[PDB]
């Protein structure tokens, strides 16, 4: 349930969950000095009993403590954007940030749902879109793109 | 009050203790993600306030966590011996059991009471010291050997 992302340098182990082997997400230490994302261990605790999955030592819940120091540690780390064709690398804490924005995010049609990055939506929407809504210049009805010809050859004009 | 002695590679910051500026000695964290030794965040809340000296926020004594993950990463850095000549490197959780070995370390003559490094103490023991105890072929008093001269020529022969 750890960070998936690529980061660059690469991630040390020191930061990596030994239970999802990925970046720690909301960093805990335990009693006998090991970290997990707090999802993790917790579903541990709550699973495979009171106790540490490194070394068995006896832990409760209570006794995991937030490794705020990790975390901001973690956050500061730079990552390249997953979308394909961005370029971008920021520190992880701006990653989600950026996701929103990014031109290289994948999106649906609000038309026919099919899948577009961002940079070329606008382009897909009103230019190629199949479901792209359009008027007849004799009735003013309104219609896909694609139902065009044939309502042209029997609009009541 | 922490850990002073020589890191190689160098200690790194994330390592140091805000207050002392050397490694973390039993390293504990506060809620708000900095580490400290133990006894300088307590010196510093007991003398400069219930807070973290880094960032003013509140801080209680009972809300400190003992950092076991961050002292068990420092206790496996390699440190080098402090004594002169000695060119031993070693994790640093063994340096104390090798100080009380190591032959470069001072060590007091149980006589004069002069330092002397301790691959040194046997020859200046028994053939140096001024005040290495040694006996008279006549009357088998025990004197510093400084003083045989003077004691020859003022016998009981
Ligand atoms: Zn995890
Ligand atoms: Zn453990
Ligand atoms: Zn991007
Ligand atoms: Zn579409
Ligand atoms: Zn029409
Ligand atoms: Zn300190
Ligand atoms: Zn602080
Ligand atoms: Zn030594
Ligand atoms: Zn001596
Ligand atoms: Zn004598």
Do not use: W
């Amino acid at each position: 349930q750890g960070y998936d992302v690529e980061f660059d340098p690469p991630l040390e182990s020191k930061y990596e969950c030994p239970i999802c082997l990925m970046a720690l997400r909301e960093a805990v230490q335990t009693p006998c000095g090991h970290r997990f994302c707090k999802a993790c261990i917790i579903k541990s605790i709550r699973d495979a009993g009171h106790k540490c999955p490194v070394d068995n030592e006896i832990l409760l819940e209570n006794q995991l403590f937030p490794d705020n120091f990790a975390k901001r540690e973690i956050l500061s780390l730079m990552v390249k954007c997953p979308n394909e064709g961005c370029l971008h690398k920021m520190e992880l804490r701006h990653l989600e940030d950026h996701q929103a924005h990014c031109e290289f995010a994948l999106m649906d049609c609000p038309q026919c749902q099919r899948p577009f990055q961002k940079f070329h939506i606008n382009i897909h929407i009103l230019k190629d879109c199949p479901r792209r809504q359009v008027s007849c210049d004799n009735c003013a009805a309104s219609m896909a793109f694609e139902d065009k010809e044939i309502h042209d050859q029997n609009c009541p004009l």
